[PDB]
Symmetry: C3
Subunit: 121 residues, 3 copies
Amino acid sequence: ARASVLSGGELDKWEKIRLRPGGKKQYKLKHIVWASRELERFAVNPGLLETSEGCRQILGQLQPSLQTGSEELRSLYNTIAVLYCVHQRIDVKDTKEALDKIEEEQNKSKKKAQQAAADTG
Amino acid sequence: ARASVLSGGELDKWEKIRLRPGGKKQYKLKHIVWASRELERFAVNPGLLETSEGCRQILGQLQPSLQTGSEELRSLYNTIAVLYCVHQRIDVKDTKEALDKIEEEQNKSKKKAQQAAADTG
Amino acid sequence: ARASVLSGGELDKWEKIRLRPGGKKQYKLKHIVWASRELERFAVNPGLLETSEGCRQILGQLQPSLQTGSEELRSLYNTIAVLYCVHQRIDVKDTKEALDKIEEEQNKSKKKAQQAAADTG
Ligand SMILES: O=P(O)(O)O[C@H]1[C@H](OP(=O)(O)O)[C@H](OP(=O)(O)O)[C@@H](OP(=O)(O)O)[C@@H](OP(=O)(O)O)[C@H]1OP(=O)(O)O
Ligand SMILES: O=P(O)(O)O[C@H]1[C@H](OP(=O)(O)O)[C@H](OP(=O)(O)O)[C@@H](OP(=O)(O)O)[C@@H](OP(=O)(O)O)[C@H]1OP(=O)(O)O
Ligand SMILES: O=P(O)(O)O[C@H]1[C@H](OP(=O)(O)O)[C@H](OP(=O)(O)O)[C@@H](OP(=O)(O)O)[C@@H](OP(=O)(O)O)[C@H]1OP(=O)(O)O
């Protein structure tokens, strides 16, 4: 799943985002196929990774087994978290820098989703 | 797992259920055998399929992973939804007519259950 | 995982516990490594087996898939339920005595955890 989830542009910053913040050589194509083929190992439609919404619901489905899940499953969840921010063309140097973006997004949605329920009236 | 889930009679209608409405192929023995070696893979006791209730909750167990599930997870959930209707001896032409059965059945119970609740009172 | 999950002390009572209450075969070391290799297969972090809290959550993570789970999952859940009491140095004869009192543990907290709710104020 190389030419299906990362276009010519999104595939540049991906290989530029190093695995861990205080770490060297960045993400690679083996991770997208690893995450994709790992998604069938856990029975989750890999096609959702192609969109900016499938990667968002996959994270939700993965959060249940977050604090007790395995370590490689954490890498799977982390890789998708980056791909999510990747599809949005966000500024991200390493992995941890992206999850805080997602961690920042949760409140933003609630800060604005709840800003809509009260916006009426 | 062939002489246990579907009896000689219940298997009669099973062999006729078309896999797809706009298709011709109908169910077979492998579709329940494959289903057998699919829930054990996903840590689910297959014996539940034998009963008319062991299939009404396996689907409830798979509904969470349905909207984001893989392809075989969909076909797996398909085979059980039909087996439930079979254990009810309900006349279902193809897969779709059975898929709507459960959804047409959810409100059915809830309609009279809630009514039965309000009926007491 | 043989020299990490259970210390020299708690590694003895495990050897004393027989598989079934009215049975003979007792627990061994292949049940912890097997349980370790299994939760690994289930995207579960094995390290939590080494603490009195790492297994309290694994049980909760497995409680949902209990009523419809497989038998080797039935055995896997039973293994951690026993080693949990092992990490508590509780006196349990067989696998059932621990299971019976594991469900004897939630309400006791709620018994006085809800007490503190009214004890405060
Ligand atoms: O490792 P280097 O070849 O010395 O250059 C790296 C990095 O290289 P890669 O990300 O491709 O591995 C960037 O990419 P290149 O220009 O070398 O292709 C480069 O410049 P860009 O980031 O603009 O692409 C620069 O990063 P930056 O310019 O943001 O500082 C950074 O140089 P350092 O080795 O000094 O970190
Ligand atoms: O006596 P009914 O008005 O016919 O209701 C009874 C029953 O009543 P009691 O158990 O209190 O005698 C339950 O009462 P409510 O829930 O409506 O208050 C009700 O629902 P539940 O049992 O789910 O609580 C349902 O029982 P069941 O759902 O098991 O069939 C059953 O109503 P029906 O006699 O119409 O079936
Ligand atoms: O099997 P036995 O050698 O006959 O002894 C067993 C048991 O041994 P197991 O670990 O093999 O089950 C205990 O330990 P050991 O005799 O092997 O040292 C022993 O004493 P402890 O339980 O205090 O260790 C006692 O168990 P209990 O007194 O709780 O019944 C019980 O003896 P019997 O099976 O012969 O009654």
